[PDB]
Subunit: 113 residues, 2 copies
């Protein structure tokens, strides 16, 4: 799903620690974890960034969160977690393929960066 490292992962061209997959999204552990549990849920549709998401993508985006909340429970995150979407330079988006970060396993702090 795209010309980024995330597309190669969806195409199983390179390995990743896959947590969940369905016909429209993929959840896998972040290769550079920022908490004891740090995973990503990404759509298979290549949406480069949240800023260009069409209105029609609405339920799909909601799907990423539902899948994220479910994956978090099965990863033992019963005390809480933080969901994050980064947009552009100021947002610190590392890959231009929409991705929802889910982090937990430790006390997350405020401000969120």
């Amino acid at each position: 799903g795209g010309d980024t490292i995330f597309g190669k992962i969806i195409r199983k061209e390179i390995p990743a620690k896959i947590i969940f997959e369905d016909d429209r999204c993929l959840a896998f552990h972040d290769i550079s974890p920022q908490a004891p549990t740090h995973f990503l849920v990404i759509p298979k549709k290549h949406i480069s960034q949240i800023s260009v998401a069409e209105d029609d993508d609405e339920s799909l985006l909601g799907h990423l969160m539902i899948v994220g909340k479910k994956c978090a429970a099965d990863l033992g995150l019963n005390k809480g977690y933080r969901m994050v979407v980064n947009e552009g330079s100021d947002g610190g988006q590392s890959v231009y393929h929409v991705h929802l970060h889910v982090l937990g396993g430790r006390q997350m702090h405020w401000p969120p960066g």
Copy 2:
């Protein structure tokens, strides 16, 4: 729309600087901003936290993000921003009514708290 602070804001009982409102959500400025621009997008329907969101809530959740990105564009966040949903204690969720944080106007750092 609920038993919390946000329920009161939705019912216009306590003031808030509204950026956007529709039949499903409300977007307003955070009173303790963590960036030059910092606003919240909450559903009018009272979901206490994302971990208890139902499968049917996916359109509403994705709607929070579609509204957040639109509002961010309207607020002139062209360099980027970060969206955050906090869950439970470890997530640093203090208000028990699902909210989405949209922060921008400065460089956001890694990790996100």
